[PDB]
Amino acid sequence: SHMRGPDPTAASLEASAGPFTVRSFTVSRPSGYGAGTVYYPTNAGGTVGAIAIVPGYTARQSSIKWWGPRLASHGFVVITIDTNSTLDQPESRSSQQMAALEQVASLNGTSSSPIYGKVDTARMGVMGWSMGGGGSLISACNNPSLKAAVVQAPWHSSTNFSCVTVPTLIFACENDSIAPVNSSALPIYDSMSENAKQFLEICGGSHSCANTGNSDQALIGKKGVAWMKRFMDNDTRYSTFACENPNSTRVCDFRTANCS
């Protein structure tokens, strides 16, 4: 019972910004991770959940930053991070992701912070690209109270994510050469038995097909926002957009199970 904003439409979800005004700040003393930018709604009308987003191997915040304003404008506090090192592996990335959520919780309690009192610390979600995606799944396995996960071209040495009980959306990139769909994304998707889950493969995509500047932001943004609003807010006004096949020629494989 955490509704923010009006009933959504396709158009309102496809737009570059949702209903809320977004401001941001850069974390002064990032504690447990490399750097962070916090995006927040000024006017969501209530506390909102928090989401931490982690980049890929070799990559920096810029690679995933487009998600920060996109999600925050629909009613989330969103921290986009740099890892301690561009060469951190998935386990490290998961620890840093959780550290980022932890510092957002601290700042929610800090009267000097722009996000003072804006966060519902009981409602948190995880996202990431590449190893940041594999780290997000680790996070969800270790912390089953997380409300949702949205990952893109996830990377891990294993495909065994049967441990993920949280609602999980996987964006895959059809022609990914780093994390091939058939040997990575689809096995990971199929390993999950215990949860609402979805698999959306972007036609022609390379490993970076869901990153900042991508050609499919209306589609990808609509789906990521819809999944987060549905599951982080238990907002069934978003069931339509979270669960649907989005009838897009830019989707080359779509699967979902246990969605409502």
Short mmCIF file of C-alpha atoms in Angstrom, two decimals:
data_model
loop_
_atom_site.label_atom_id
_atom_site.label_comp_id
_atom_site.label_asym_id
_atom_site.label_seq_id
_atom_site.Cartn_x
_atom_site.Cartn_y
_atom_site.Cartn_z
CA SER A 1 0.00 0.00 0.00
CA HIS A 2 2.63 2.45 -1.22
CA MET A 3 1.05 4.08 -4.25
CA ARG A 4 2.71 7.20 -5.62
CA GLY A 5 1.57 9.08 -8.74
CA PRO A 6 -1.42 8.33 -11.04
CA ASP A 7 -2.37 5.22 -12.95
CA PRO A 8 0.42 4.80 -15.49
CA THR A 9 0.03 4.64 -19.26
CA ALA A 10 2.37 3.29 -21.92
CA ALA A 11 3.06 6.87 -23.00
CA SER A 12 3.85 8.08 -19.46
CA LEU A 13 6.25 5.13 -18.92
CA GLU A 14 7.92 5.51 -22.38
CA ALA A 15 8.63 9.24 -21.81
CA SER A 16 12.08 10.28 -20.75
CA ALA A 17 10.74 11.45 -17.35
CA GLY A 18 7.93 10.41 -15.01
CA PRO A 19 5.77 12.76 -12.91
CA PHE A 20 8.17 13.79 -10.16
CA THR A 21 10.83 16.50 -10.22
CA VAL A 22 14.30 14.99 -9.78
CA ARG A 23 17.27 16.50 -8.01
CA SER A 24 20.54 14.85 -7.15
CA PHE A 25 23.75 15.06 -5.23
CA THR A 26 27.07 13.30 -5.14
CA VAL A 27 27.92 11.43 -1.97
CA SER A 28 30.65 13.36 -0.13
CA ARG A 29 32.21 10.42 1.69
CA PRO A 30 31.23 7.19 -0.04
CA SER A 31 31.45 4.48 2.60
CA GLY A 32 32.23 1.00 1.32
CA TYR A 33 32.16 1.71 -2.45
CA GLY A 34 33.94 4.03 -4.86
CA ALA A 35 31.59 6.93 -5.53
CA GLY A 36 27.85 7.55 -5.77
CA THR A 37 25.28 9.89 -7.25
CA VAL A 38 21.91 10.00 -5.48
CA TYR A 39 18.85 10.88 -7.51
CA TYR A 40 15.64 11.66 -5.67
CA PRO A 41 12.12 12.99 -6.22
CA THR A 42 11.40 16.34 -4.61
CA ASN A 43 7.64 15.80 -4.65
CA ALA A 44 6.71 12.10 -4.56
CA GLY A 45 4.11 12.73 -1.84
CA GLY A 46 5.43 10.14 0.63
CA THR A 47 8.51 8.10 1.42
CA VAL A 48 9.78 5.98 -1.45
CA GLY A 49 11.95 2.92 -1.82
CA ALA A 50 15.66 2.97 -2.60
CA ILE A 51 17.53 1.31 -5.51
CA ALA A 52 21.31 0.84 -5.90
CA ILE A 53 22.73 0.44 -9.41
CA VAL A 54 26.14 -1.02 -10.17
CA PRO A 55 28.14 -0.83 -13.45
CA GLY A 56 29.94 -3.56 -15.33
CA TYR A 57 33.48 -4.84 -15.35
CA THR A 58 35.90 -2.08 -16.43
CA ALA A 59 33.05 0.45 -16.37
CA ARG A 60 32.06 3.56 -14.47
CA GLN A 61 28.85 5.18 -13.31
CA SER A 62 28.21 6.79 -16.70
CA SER A 63 27.42 3.34 -18.17
CA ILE A 64 24.29 2.95 -16.03
CA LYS A 65 23.55 6.52 -14.96
CA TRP A 66 20.57 7.04 -17.30
CA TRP A 67 18.54 4.88 -14.91
CA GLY A 68 19.01 7.36 -12.04
CA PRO A 69 16.71 10.19 -13.21
CA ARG A 70 14.48 7.78 -15.12
CA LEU A 71 13.59 5.77 -12.01
CA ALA A 72 13.75 8.68 -9.51
CA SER A 73 11.17 10.63 -11.58
CA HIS A 74 8.66 7.78 -10.97
CA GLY A 75 9.19 7.74 -7.20
CA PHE A 76 12.48 6.20 -5.98
CA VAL A 77 15.69 7.30 -4.37
CA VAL A 78 18.33 5.87 -6.71
CA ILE A 79 22.08 5.63 -6.07
CA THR A 80 24.33 4.97 -9.06
CA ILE A 81 27.82 3.85 -7.97
CA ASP A 82 31.40 3.52 -9.01
CA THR A 83 33.00 0.47 -7.53
CA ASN A 84 36.21 0.67 -5.50
CA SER A 85 38.06 -0.66 -8.57
CA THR A 86 36.89 -1.08 -12.17
CA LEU A 87 38.17 -4.67 -11.84
CA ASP A 88 36.04 -5.73 -8.84
CA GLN A 89 34.37 -9.11 -9.29
CA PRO A 90 30.65 -9.92 -8.61
CA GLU A 91 30.95 -10.74 -4.86
CA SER A 92 32.74 -7.47 -4.18
CA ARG A 93 30.19 -5.60 -6.29
CA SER A 94 27.34 -7.11 -4.26
CA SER A 95 28.97 -6.02 -0.99
CA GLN A 96 29.43 -2.51 -2.39
CA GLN A 97 25.84 -2.38 -3.66
CA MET A 98 24.58 -3.24 -0.20
CA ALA A 99 26.95 -0.67 1.32
CA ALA A 100 25.43 1.95 -1.04
CA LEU A 101 21.89 1.09 0.17
CA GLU A 102 23.20 1.22 3.73
CA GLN A 103 24.59 4.75 3.24
CA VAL A 104 21.33 5.87 1.64
CA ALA A 105 19.66 4.66 4.85
CA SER A 106 22.17 6.73 6.93
CA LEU A 107 21.55 9.82 4.81
CA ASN A 108 17.77 9.37 5.19
CA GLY A 109 18.41 9.89 8.90
CA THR A 110 20.73 12.88 8.37
CA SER A 111 19.08 16.31 8.61
CA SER A 112 21.73 17.93 6.36
CA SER A 113 21.03 15.48 3.50
CA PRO A 114 18.72 16.31 0.58
CA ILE A 115 17.16 12.82 1.12
CA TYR A 116 16.40 13.36 4.84
CA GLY A 117 13.13 11.59 5.51
CA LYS A 118 12.53 10.69 1.84
CA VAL A 119 13.28 6.95 2.03
CA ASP A 120 11.36 3.91 3.19
CA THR A 121 14.34 1.82 4.30
CA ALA A 122 12.14 -1.31 4.35
CA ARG A 123 11.71 -1.20 0.57
CA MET A 124 14.96 -1.63 -1.38
CA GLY A 125 15.90 -2.91 -4.81
CA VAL A 126 19.01 -3.79 -6.78
CA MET A 127 20.14 -3.28 -10.36
CA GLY A 128 23.22 -3.55 -12.45
CA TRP A 129 24.98 -4.32 -15.72
CA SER A 130 27.45 -7.11 -16.36
CA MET A 131 29.20 -8.06 -13.08
CA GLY A 132 27.02 -5.38 -11.41
CA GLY A 133 24.08 -7.53 -12.58
CA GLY A 134 25.64 -10.72 -11.26
CA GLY A 135 26.30 -8.79 -8.00
CA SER A 136 22.62 -7.78 -7.88
CA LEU A 137 21.56 -11.41 -8.05
CA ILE A 138 24.03 -12.29 -5.28
CA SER A 139 22.53 -9.40 -3.25
CA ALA A 140 19.04 -10.81 -3.75
CA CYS A 141 20.15 -14.33 -2.74
CA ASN A 142 21.80 -13.08 0.46
CA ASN A 143 19.04 -10.53 1.28
CA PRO A 144 15.66 -12.00 0.31
CA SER A 145 13.84 -9.01 1.83
CA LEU A 146 14.89 -6.97 -1.21
CA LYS A 147 11.72 -6.19 -3.13
CA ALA A 148 12.94 -6.40 -6.74
CA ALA A 149 15.93 -6.86 -9.01
CA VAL A 150 16.37 -5.49 -12.52
CA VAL A 151 19.59 -6.59 -14.23
CA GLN A 152 21.06 -6.14 -17.71
CA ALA A 153 23.43 -8.51 -19.46
CA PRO A 154 24.28 -10.06 -16.07
CA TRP A 155 27.70 -11.70 -15.67
CA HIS A 156 28.73 -14.38 -13.21
CA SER A 157 30.98 -17.45 -13.41
CA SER A 158 27.94 -19.58 -12.46
CA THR A 159 24.41 -19.78 -13.86
CA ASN A 160 23.02 -21.25 -10.60
CA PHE A 161 20.67 -18.54 -9.28
CA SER A 162 18.03 -20.86 -7.88
CA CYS A 163 18.66 -18.90 -4.65
CA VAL A 164 16.93 -15.77 -6.07
CA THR A 165 13.46 -15.48 -4.49
CA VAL A 166 12.91 -11.84 -5.32
CA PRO A 167 10.96 -10.63 -8.37
CA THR A 168 13.64 -10.40 -11.08
CA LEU A 169 13.66 -8.85 -14.56
CA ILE A 170 16.61 -9.72 -16.83
CA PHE A 171 17.39 -7.63 -19.88
CA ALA A 172 19.54 -9.59 -22.32
CA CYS A 173 21.30 -8.40 -25.44
CA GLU A 174 20.73 -10.72 -28.36
CA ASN A 175 24.26 -10.67 -29.82
CA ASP A 176 26.14 -10.32 -26.53
CA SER A 177 29.62 -11.82 -26.97
CA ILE A 178 30.80 -11.31 -23.37
CA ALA A 179 27.84 -12.99 -21.69
CA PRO A 180 26.23 -15.03 -24.51
CA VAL A 181 22.46 -15.27 -24.05
CA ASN A 182 22.31 -19.07 -24.50
CA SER A 183 25.09 -19.83 -22.00
CA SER A 184 24.50 -16.99 -19.51
CA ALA A 185 21.25 -14.98 -19.39
CA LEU A 186 18.84 -17.80 -20.33
CA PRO A 187 20.37 -20.37 -17.95
CA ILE A 188 20.31 -17.78 -15.15
CA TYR A 189 16.66 -17.00 -15.96
CA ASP A 190 15.77 -20.71 -16.08
CA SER A 191 17.56 -21.43 -12.75
CA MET A 192 15.04 -19.29 -10.86
CA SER A 193 12.09 -21.39 -9.75
CA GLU A 194 10.98 -19.52 -6.66
CA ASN A 195 9.89 -16.12 -7.96
CA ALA A 196 8.10 -13.70 -10.29
CA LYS A 197 10.58 -13.38 -13.17
CA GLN A 198 10.93 -12.01 -16.66
CA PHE A 199 13.40 -12.24 -19.56
CA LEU A 200 13.51 -9.63 -22.30
CA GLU A 201 16.11 -9.90 -25.08
CA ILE A 202 16.88 -6.77 -27.10
CA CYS A 203 17.29 -7.47 -30.83
CA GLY A 204 20.80 -7.05 -32.28
CA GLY A 205 22.20 -5.93 -28.96
CA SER A 206 25.84 -6.00 -27.90
CA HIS A 207 26.78 -6.38 -24.23
CA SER A 208 26.12 -2.66 -23.71
CA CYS A 209 22.61 -2.65 -25.22
CA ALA A 210 20.83 -1.38 -22.04
CA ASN A 211 23.48 1.21 -21.09
CA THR A 212 23.36 4.99 -21.09
CA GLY A 213 22.71 6.29 -24.61
CA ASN A 214 21.09 3.07 -25.86
CA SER A 215 18.66 3.06 -28.83
CA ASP A 216 15.79 1.51 -26.80
CA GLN A 217 15.33 3.80 -23.75
CA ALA A 218 11.57 4.22 -24.17
CA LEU A 219 11.07 0.40 -24.15
CA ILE A 220 13.77 -0.52 -21.61
CA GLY A 221 12.89 2.36 -19.28
CA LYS A 222 9.20 1.56 -19.39
CA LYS A 223 9.88 -2.09 -18.44
CA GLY A 224 12.44 -1.33 -15.69
CA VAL A 225 10.27 1.35 -14.13
CA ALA A 226 7.19 -0.86 -14.39
CA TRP A 227 8.90 -3.80 -12.70
CA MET A 228 10.24 -1.58 -9.89
CA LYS A 229 6.90 0.19 -9.31
CA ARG A 230 5.02 -3.09 -9.34
CA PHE A 231 7.30 -4.97 -6.94
CA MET A 232 8.94 -2.33 -4.79
CA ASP A 233 5.60 -0.58 -4.13
CA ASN A 234 3.29 -3.68 -4.40
CA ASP A 235 1.39 -1.43 -6.86
CA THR A 236 -0.85 -3.56 -9.01
CA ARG A 237 -1.72 -0.54 -11.19
CA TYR A 238 1.62 -1.52 -12.79
CA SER A 239 0.75 -5.18 -13.28
CA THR A 240 -0.21 -4.48 -16.89
CA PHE A 241 3.19 -2.99 -17.81
CA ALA A 242 5.28 -5.28 -15.60
CA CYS A 243 3.83 -8.51 -16.88
CA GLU A 244 3.00 -7.78 -20.54
CA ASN A 245 4.80 -8.89 -23.62
CA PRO A 246 5.45 -5.31 -24.83
CA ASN A 247 4.67 -6.00 -28.52
CA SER A 248 7.94 -4.52 -29.76
CA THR A 249 9.94 -5.49 -32.86
CA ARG A 250 12.99 -4.64 -30.70
CA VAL A 251 12.28 -7.64 -28.45
CA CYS A 252 13.72 -10.85 -29.91
CA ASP A 253 12.79 -13.23 -27.02
CA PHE A 254 10.30 -12.58 -24.19
CA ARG A 255 9.49 -14.89 -21.30
CA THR A 256 7.81 -14.40 -17.94
CA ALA A 257 6.65 -16.71 -15.12
CA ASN A 258 4.67 -16.10 -11.90
CA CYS A 259 4.03 -12.45 -12.78
CA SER A 260 0.96 -10.64 -11.35
#
